[PDB]
Amino acid sequence: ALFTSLVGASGLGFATKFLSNKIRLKPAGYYPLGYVFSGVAWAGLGLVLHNVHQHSLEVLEKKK
Amino acid sequence: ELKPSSAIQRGPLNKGGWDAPHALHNDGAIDRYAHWRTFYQERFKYTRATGKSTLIFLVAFPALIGYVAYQSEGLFEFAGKRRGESVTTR
């Protein structure tokens, strides 16, 4: 499901932001707008991967 | 001229906790005996006795059990064997 992929990729973005805060010796919610930013960016990458994969499946099926 | 940042303030690592009264009266002789027994592997050497025990337990005993177990494989069947019948299959 596309929605599930976007949620998952956004979760990866949140994980990256949280790990970045902790690596800076900062509180987990140090700059809460960064969570939104990183989640949006990683959701974009997840969407790109999803579209490429769907196109690949389409091509594989069309040769039948 | 290369020195860590003055911005850093370093304090002690204290582990915290409540120092309990010391309920064991350590015996130095027992501790040394325990340490010797615990790290015996660091000082093991191959001699006549040690080699003898090695060649017994790691070689001779496994060979005996292997001969028994491969010689006797499938040899016996006991379930409900009656008089006159052979309990051996070969």
Binding site: - | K45, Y46, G51, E73, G74, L75, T89, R90
Partner: protein
């Protein structure tokens, strides 16, 4: 199996080992008539390893009339004996013997080759499920094997019988 000519092959191995030890000695010299004085006996190392390995390998292969990893195990044992004699200690001699023998036995078991035997490999072999009633080859798989093959390979007993029990013990 037709025999290895142990004498000849061992002689060629002696020659190769002597040359290799010579090359190692020349290198050793360059990196450090004194070349053999300050050799460290490397010429002897090479010569003895060569003669031991080749002679024991051919000897064992000829005696057993087989070619497999066990011959390499024996040959590695001999080579390790040679290399561990240099320690002049019985435990180290035994350790070199047994461990070099084990390592070379593993080597001979895998094929006694560093690269691959391409024709026997899975990528170049018949694989997948076999057809109607064909004999099983090494890499192929079935859904059912013939019971006679089971009885011959595994052996009779321990629940391996020619006929299923219930069939055999059926009354009429």
């Amino acid at each position: 199996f037709h025999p290895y000519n142990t004498l000849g092959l061992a002689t060629q191995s002696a020659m190769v080992g002597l040359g290799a030890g010579v090359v190692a000695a020349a290198a050793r010299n360059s990196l450090a008539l004194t070349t053999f004085s300050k050799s460290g006996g490397v010429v002897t190392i090479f010569t003895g390893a060569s003669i031991a390995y080749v002679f024991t390998y051919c000897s064992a292969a000829n005696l057993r009339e087989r070619k497999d990893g066990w011959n390499h195990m024996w040959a590695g044992a001999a080579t390790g004996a040679v290399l561990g004699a240099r320690t002049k200690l019985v435990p180290a001699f035994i350790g070199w013997t047994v461990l070099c023998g084990a390592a070379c036995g593993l080597f001979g078991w895998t094929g006694a080759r560093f690269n691959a035997d391409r024709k026997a490999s899975l990528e170049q072999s018949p694989k997948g499920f076999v057809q109607e009633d064909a004999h099983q080859t090494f890499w192929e798989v079935v859904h059912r094997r013939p019971l006679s093959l089971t009885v011959e390979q595994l052996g009779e007993g321990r629940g391996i019988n020619a006929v299923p029990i219930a069939t055999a013990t059926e009354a009429p």
